[PDB]
Structure 1
Amino acid sequence: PSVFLFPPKPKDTLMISRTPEVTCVVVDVSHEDPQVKFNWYVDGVQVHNAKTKPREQQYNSTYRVVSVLTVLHQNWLDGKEYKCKVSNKALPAPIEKTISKAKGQPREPQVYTLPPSREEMTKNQVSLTCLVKGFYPSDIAVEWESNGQPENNYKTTPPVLDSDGSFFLYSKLTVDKSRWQQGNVFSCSVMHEALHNHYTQKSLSL
């Protein structure tokens, strides 16, 4: 049997309104010893129940047990440890897996929107670019809007560790050549630990 600890998604922890949850998944459990026992420890204290919640799935030719511990935004953002310690008679010694966020001192993301190259106006569709650079830790959420209306045709590169020991990423919104010339305003919205309201938005137009 194998244990896998998963962290919360950034938007969920940067929005008060949302629900961060550190998820523990046990694979290869088996039919002969399906008896999995979970021990959730925040930072050192067994948060015992908190509001932990398992269940058994009958997979492969084996079982799959998942439990969830609902993470408290502030505890997350201050860098607690989260330990999922799983007992199961088959498994000789109980597997412990511990998680947190990237140990360091957080840096505010510089957000610059870039309009399309002259040459790309030769094309039928143009590329709108925003750079998010010199941020830390690499937990971020970047989106695009045309108004009070969210957009579709965008793609975001994985956070690349730059030279500073800070991170960078580019995000590419592709639009019809026309709209951009019909003087529309497209915004890139960045969400990060170290942003003023955990949010910033830079805009683009013709």
Structure 2
Amino acid sequence: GPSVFLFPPKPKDTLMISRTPEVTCVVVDVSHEDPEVKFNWYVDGVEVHNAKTKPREEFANSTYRVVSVLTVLHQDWLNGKEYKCKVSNKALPAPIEKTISKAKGQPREPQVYTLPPSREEMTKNQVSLTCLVKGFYPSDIAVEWESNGQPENNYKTTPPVLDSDGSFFLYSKLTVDKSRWQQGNVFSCSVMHEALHNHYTQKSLSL
């Protein structure tokens, strides 16, 4: 019948105390003639009742989609506490139990190296800046680009890749005009990982 998916909190939400993290239980393909679902959240076995059910959606399919959100404590997720979502539906015989938690294992603090473009690239109106982030565990991490305080435009970050030493790495590419590189402006790679100091580090790249 209906399928159930559990989505962990965004890394940036857990690494900054100022921000609000939350585990998300999304159950889809719930039948049109069975609107009533029943969530049961469990933090390390202990059932909690501070969750909140977002408003539901009707699709072209006509199969309704119900989402329940539980706000968590940053340290509780950082401590690797298990979160278990139990979805109960009138169509299914047995409720669907799902479980999500922080990736288990000895954490490693990422090293971050900024790499300038190549001469061969210079010929072009738009050159690329590279940020190498390697040797981090787990895969949870958030990387951004900025210049002179405000966020930078046109960057993409590649997914985490499993490396030889059992750790992850990634590369982030920021596309800027040849001018802004030759004009002497200074850009910055902001890396946010839990094993870092204050869950934050920053490397400045410039001509």
TM-score (norm 2): 0.94
- Flag the 1:166–1:22 CA change in 2: closer, same or farther, 3 A: same
**Contact 1:52/1:70 (CA < 8 Å) preserved in 2?**
no
Q: Which residue of 2 aligns with 1:189?
A: 190
Mean Cα deviation higher: 23-32 or 76-85: 23-32
Partner of 1:178: 179
Structure 1's 170 and 77: CA in aligned 2 closer, same or farther, altered over 3 A? same
Encode CA deviations 1:94-142: one digit per residue, 9 max, x unaligned: 1100000111111001000011112211222211111000011011111
Q: Secondary structure at the match of 2:58?
A: strand
Residue 51 (structure 1) shift? 5.3
CA change 1:58–1:125 in 2 (3 A) is closer
Structure 2 Cα separation of the partners of residues 5 and 84 of structure 1: 8
Distance 1:45 1:65, change over 3 A: same
Structure 1 range deviating more: 121-130 or 169-178:
121-130
- Contact kept in structure 2, 1:55 and 1:67, CA below 8 Å: no
Contact 1:144 1:186 in 2 (8 A): yes
The alpha-carbon distance between structure 1 residues 173 and 122, as it changes in their structure 2 partners (threshold 3 A), is same
Q: Tell me, which stretches of 5 or more residues in structure 1 are unaligned?
A: none
1:54/1:68 contact within 8 Å kept: no
Structure 2: gaps of 5 or more residues: none
Matched residue SS, 2:12? helix
State the Cα distance separating 1:48 from its structure 2 match: 2.7
Q: Is the 8 A contact 1:125 1:174 kept in 2?
A: yes
Is the 8 Å Cα contact of residues 56 and 66 (structure 1) preserved in structure 2?
no
Question: For residues 168 and 32 of structure 1, do their structure 2 counterparts lie closer, same or farther at Cα, with a shift above 3 Å needed?
Answer: same
Whole-Å separation in 2 of the counterparts to 1:124 and 1:149: 22
Counterpart Cα distance in 2 of 1:117 and 1:44 = 54
In 1: Cα distance, 2:37 partner to 2:12 partner: 31
Q: In 2, distance between residues paired with 1:62 and 1:173? A: 40
Residues 1:56 and 1:115: Cα distance change in structure 2 (over 3 Å): closer
Equivalent position SS for 1:80: coil
Change (3 A) 1:95 1:139: same
CA contact (8 A) 2:34 2:91 kept: yes
**Alignment partners' CA distance in 1, 2:108 and 2:205:** 24
Two-structure CA RMSD over aligned residues (Å): 1.6
User: Corresponding residue for 1:51?
Assistant: 52
Structure 1: 4+ residue segments shifted above 6 A = none
1:42-89 deviation digits (Å, cap 9, x = unpaired)? 111001335566656566222221111111111001111110001112
Aligned residues of 2:83 and 2:101 also touching (Cα < 8 A): yes
Question: Aligned residue for 1:72?
Answer: 73
3-state SS, counterpart of residue 65 of structure 1: strand
Q: 1:170 to 1:56 in 2, by over 3 A?
A: closer
Task: Report the secondary structure of 1:134's partner residue.
Answer: strand
Quickly say closer, same or farther: Cα 1:69–1:59, change in 2 above 3 A: farther
| Residue 32 of structure 1: how far off its partner (Å) | 2.2
Does structure 1 conserve the Cα–Cα contact (< 8 Å) formed by 2:56 and 2:64?
no
